Structure 1
Amino acid sequence: VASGSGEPREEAGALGPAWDESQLRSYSFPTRPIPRLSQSDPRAEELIENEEPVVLTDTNLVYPALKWDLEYLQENIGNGDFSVYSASTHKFLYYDEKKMANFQNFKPRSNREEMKFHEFVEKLQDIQQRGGEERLYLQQTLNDTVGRKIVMDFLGFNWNWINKQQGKRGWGQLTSNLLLIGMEGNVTPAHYDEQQNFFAQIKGYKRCILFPPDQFECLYPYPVHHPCDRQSQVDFDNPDYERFPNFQNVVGYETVVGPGDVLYIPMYWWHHIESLLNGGITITVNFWYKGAPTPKRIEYPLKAHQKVAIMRNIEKMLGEALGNPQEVGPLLNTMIKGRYN
């Protein structure tokens, strides 16, 4: 179970338990808790330099955004196009649409749709009213388009702190700034990203379950050329242990983040994210940085994330070299069977 869940944190002014574990979903693997530390704490600077997850609790990274809510955003964000994904269920499986023309026989069960902010809230209001079970997840990189109040907020982020982290870790350019607004219960299934991430919680509480790259074997990512590249094939809600036996060996690092917490998700680390049930609307901003460049002459034994990049590159080479990504599997199997297995 979630031994790493944590005894819920008690909010100041004794306004109750921020959340209780009945708002966490039930899963078949154990976990240990991610450390919640202060930014000044050197234990937390060492966790980051060693690419290990840590919850930073007092960065003020997005202090101005803590006032955010739907009303405030609607009135001040502009008339921009905001990507919004629909879903039949709590699970939000996402598809790379450009990879979409390889496989045609894995149909789409979560779809994008541009909206103006007022229409999005519109949709939640009516879904709200009719008690519907459709779920929505807004996910959009904010850009200069936005309102005057929201540019001032963005400018009030603690750029000095994060910009220092980018330099101290030798990381590369901030790639993007997604904003996520999601409904209670919504789940982003387990996946890994190729970039260092600072996951900055604003409104609501999110449960984050991470796994290290070295548990690649237990999480069974889709093929690289598949639309669900970098997602785990394993249904966390009902695992198929015959197809994925080593998911019985998976142990996670877990934590619940709330307003003001910043969760460092090291690159290539798996993460599963859920907005707690009956916790209402969640709001997050993410800060993705190209990771540090790989030194010129490499140190063995390699680290797990480098082996992952290798496997990824093998799949990519073979896809181009064979003229068809769908021959990758067959060739790899003939390479292995009775030779390496």
Structure 2
Amino acid sequence: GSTVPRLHRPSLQHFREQFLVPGRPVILKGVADHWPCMQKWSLEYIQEIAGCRTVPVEVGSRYTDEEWSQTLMTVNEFISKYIVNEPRDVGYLAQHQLFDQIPELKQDISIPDYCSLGDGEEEEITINAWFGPQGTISPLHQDPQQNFLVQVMGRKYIRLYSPQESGALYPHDTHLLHNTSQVDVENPDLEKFPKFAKAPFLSCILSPGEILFIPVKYWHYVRALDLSFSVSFWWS
């Protein structure tokens, strides 16, 4: 593959014509790099502002695992058990609308201006938190809206496959998981999934301050390389 291109504060028009309309990924630089979250969100700050609130936590290496489960605990409990104290299992505070739950945190982020190029209402943009230790993995899957994934703490390795390559990604046949690949991107079973090997892709390491544009229906796979906090904006 090649690396996702990085662009510094492209104009709305450039973003619209070269990335949004054709559905091409890009990393936006110089857009979120000075949001307050970038300097402010330490573990300690997260504990102070959110520690006592209940959050959903995914436990297990990948959501496609058979032993994978979902539970509830306080943010303080999550940090203690799954981040700081030699964790026994992988825990991920994933896909959670933390900013609706805790409006004060919402002050530390913004809606990217590029979202106004969409046809949807700003109020209907879904903002999710993704907070977890090094080693969290989100299996290869596609989503039904455009996405800006903003990296705040730590880095993520991300692999992207175009919707045109769906055949080689062997989606699950169950209507429920049909937007998830059967393939483990970083250790694929080529005896069972031979078409996967030659499928072209883009990749990147997404670092703090950077925004990855994931076009609607683009397949994406994500592994945290460090203690990580990302904020996703699902928009149309």
Q: When the two structures are superposed, what TM-score results if normalisation uses the length of structure 2? A: 0.88
Who is 1:142 aligned against? 98
- Equivalent residues, number: 231
Partners of 1:40 and 1:214 in 2: how far apart?
A: 26
* Residues 1:241 and 2:190 aligned together: yes
Who is 1:39 aligned against? 9
* Residues 1:55 and 2:13 aligned together: no
1:270 Cα offset (Å): 0.5
**Cα 1:189/1:144, change in 2 over 3 Å:** closer
Who is 2:73 aligned against? 115
Partners of 2:21 and 2:34 in 1: how far apart?
A: 22
**Cα 1:49/1:110, change in 2 over 3 Å:** same
Higher strand share: 2
Structure 1 moving runs of 4+ over 3 Å: 41-45, 171-175
Which one has a bigger Cα radius of gyration? 1
SS at match of 2:223: strand
1:165-176 to 2 correspondence within 5 Å? 165-171=114-120, 174-176=124-126
Higher helix share: 1
Who is 2:58 aligned against? 85
Q: Deviation per CA, 1:189-244, whole angstroms, max 9, x where unpaired?
A: 11111110000000001111101000001001102424x33111012343233332
**CA RMSD of the aligned region, Å?**
2.3
Identity %: 28
1:260 Cα offset (Å): 0.8
1:124 Cα offset (Å): 2.9
* Residues 1:257 and 2:193 aligned together: no
**Cα 1:265/1:125, change in 2 over 3 Å:** closer
SS at match of 2:168: helix
Partners of 2:121 and 2:62 in 1: how far apart?
A: 29
Who is 1:73 aligned against? 46
1:56 Cα offset (Å): 0.1
* Residues 1:194 and 2:149 aligned together: no
Partners of 2:213 and 2:66 in 1: how far apart?
A: 31
1:133 Cα offset (Å): 4.5
1:244-323 to 2 correspondence within 5 Å? 244-276=193-225, 279=226, 281-289=227-235, 291=236
Partners of 2:209 and 2:84 in 1: how far apart?
A: 30
1:57 Cα offset (Å): 0.7
Partners of 1:62 and 1:286 in 2: how far apart?
A: 17
SS at match of 2:196: helix
Q: Report the AA paired with residue 266 of structure 1.
A: P
1:126 Cα offset (Å): 6.0
Q: When the two structures are superposed, what TM-score results if normalisation uses the length of structure 1? A: 0.62
Partners of 2:31 and 2:2 in 1: how far apart?
A: 24
SS at match of 2:192: coil
